């Protein structure tokens, strides 16, 4: 009944809080300056990128190339950690770890990029994006100004984010939405669709209830959200094509092996 769907929602929220250090709540506090915390370092050009290095240096990682490449490389280290976090979260989704291990792999492989863009939107406004767990703020114009094709790499993600952020979802809503994406029965090469769709059916009911309860004045938020799920696949396909382009035209960089695993035999 409704009660069970609320228990699922809350279970997912608590798991979500455990899995993802930087929430939409924390990010929006940083971006509105409603936090007591120190303001993030603003990166708006090459000079400011350089000066911010010590303050945006994640996990004391240091390069052993040009700015465009270094940005892309930093983005890679973050994405890998996002994949790890998303994998941990997925294993908390009731029923997921009981699926065929090959199907768990397939679900993660096609889902992680859709989720990464969903969660990236929590860190963005129309003027830029929070980075290094909220310690830096990279301007949208700076990212645009990078040489091609890198210059047009993040712009699609901003256009998505501005529209998605208008739905005004919080972490408790996103926790369920993300679980819905992971449990997609139409991913290519799934062995056994039925138990995936059974779980997704429950998740979708849980999401619809959650949206009704949490946004009572926001009519058809559930339907608006489901339409964005179909748009996310495009940002992903588009993104995969760009990666394919750069992997050929840029021998000075290469993909982390985790990201190799995910991108290969994908669209």
């Amino acid at each position: 009944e409704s009660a069970d769907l609320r228990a699922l929602a809350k279970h997912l929220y608590d798991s979500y809080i455990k899995s993802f250090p930087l929430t939409k709540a924390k990010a929006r506090a940083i971006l509105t300056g409603k936090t007591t915390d120190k303001s993030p370092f603003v990166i708006y050009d090459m000079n400011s990128l350089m000066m911010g290095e010590d303050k945006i240096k994640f996990k004391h990682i240091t390069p052993l190339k040009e700015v465009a490449i270094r940005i892309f490389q930093g983005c890679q280290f973050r994405s890998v950690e996002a994949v790890q976090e998303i994998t941990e979260y997925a294993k908390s989704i009731p029923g997921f770890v009981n699926l065929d291990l090959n199907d768990q792999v397939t679900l993660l492989k096609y889902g992680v990029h859709e989720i990464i863009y969903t969660m990236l939107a929590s860190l963005m406004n129309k003027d830029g994006v929070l980075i290094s767990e909220g310690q830096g703020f990279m301007t949208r114009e700076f990212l645009k100004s990078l040489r091609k094709p890198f210059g047009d790499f993040m712009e699609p993600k901003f256009e998505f984010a501005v529209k998605f952020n208008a739905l005004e979802l919080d972490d408790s809503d996103l926790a369920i939405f993300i679980a819905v994406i992971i449990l997609s029965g139409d991913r290519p090469g799934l062995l056994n669709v039925k138990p995936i769709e059974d779980i997704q059916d429950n998740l979708l009911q849980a999401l619809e209830l959650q949206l009704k309860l949490n946004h009572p004045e926001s009519s058809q938020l559930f339907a608006k959200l489901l339409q964005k799920m179909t748009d996310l696949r495009q940002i992903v396909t588009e993104h995969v094509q760009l990666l394919q382009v750069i992997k050929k035209t840029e021998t000075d960089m290469s993909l982390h092996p985790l990201l190799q695993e995910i991108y290969k035999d994908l669209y």
Partner: peptide, 11 residues
């Protein structure tokens, strides 16, 4: 195939 993902999933 998917050695790391398998590892993360089984871990």
């Amino acid at each position: 195939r998917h050695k790391i993902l398998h590892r993360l999933l089984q871990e």
